[PDB]
Amino acid sequence: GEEDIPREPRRIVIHRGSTGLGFNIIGGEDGEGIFISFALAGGPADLSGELRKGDQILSVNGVDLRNASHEQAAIALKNAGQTVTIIAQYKPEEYSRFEA
């Protein structure tokens, strides 16, 4: 299950369409990281097969989010336009500190 999920960074392009990107993030203050916290069934992120709960979002449209606050990352995603290029890396241990 978890073992075979690729741990390298990946570049994923999704389109916003008329639906939203189809995922939520969690984060905190600068340095806490930005993680996918929820994936909407049938949304763009889900349909990609390439994004999941526990992925750290490293960048959006080339902008580094490794040290972004939650609000900073959320504004970046909201303003990323109709085509959103995400670099994500699967970080289940770090994400486990946010997920109850």
Swiss-Prot record:
Palmitoylated. Palmitoylation is required for targeting to postsynaptic density, plasma membrane and synapses. Palmitoylation by ZDHHC2 occurs when the synaptic activity decreases and induces DLG4 synaptic clustering. Palmitoylation by ZDHHC15 regulates trafficking to the postsynaptic density and function in synaptogenesis. Palmitoylation may play a role in glutamate receptor GRIA1 synapse clustering. Depalmitoylated by ABHD17A and ABHD17B and to a lesser extent by ABHD17C, ABHD12, ABHD13, LYPLA1 and LYPLA2. Ubiquitinated by MDM2 in response to NMDA receptor activation, leading to proteasome-mediated degradation of DLG4 which is required for AMPA receptor endocytosis. It is found in: Cell membrane; Postsynaptic density; Synapse; Cytoplasm. Expressed in brain (at protein level). Detected in juxtaparanodal zones in the central nervous system and at nerve terminal plexuses of basket cells in the cerebellum. Expressed in cerebrum. Expressed in hippocampal neurons (at protein level). Isoform 1 and isoform 2: highly expressed in cerebellum, cortex, hippocampus, and corpus striatum. Residues 11-91 form the PDZ domain. Signal peptide: none annotated. Belongs to the MAGUK family. Interacts through its PDZ domains with ANO2 and NETO1. Interacts with KCNJ4. Interacts through its first two PDZ domains with GRIN2A, GRIN2B, GRIN2C and GRIN2D. Interacts with ERBB4. Interacts with KCNA1, KCNA2, KCNA3 and KCNA4. Interacts with LRRC4 and LRRC4B. Interacts with SYNGAP1. Interacts with ASIC3. Interacts with SEMA4C. Interacts with CXADR. Interacts with KCND2. Interacts (via first PDZ domain) with CRIPT. Interacts through its first PDZ domain with GRIK2 and KCNA4. Interacts through its second PDZ domain with the PDZ domain of NOS1 or the C-terminus of CAPON. The PDZ domain 3 mediates interaction with ADR1B. Postsynaptic scaffolding protein that plays a critical role in synaptogenesis and synaptic plasticity by providing a platform for the postsynaptic clustering of crucial synaptic proteins. Interacts with the cytoplasmic tail of NMDA receptor subunits and shaker-type potassium channels. Required for synaptic plasticity associated with NMDA receptor signaling. Overexpression or depletion of DLG4 changes the ratio of excitatory to inhibitory synapses in hippocampal neurons. May reduce the amplitude of ASIC3 acid-evoked currents by retaining the channel intracellularly. This is Disks large homolog 4. It comes from Rattus norvegicus.
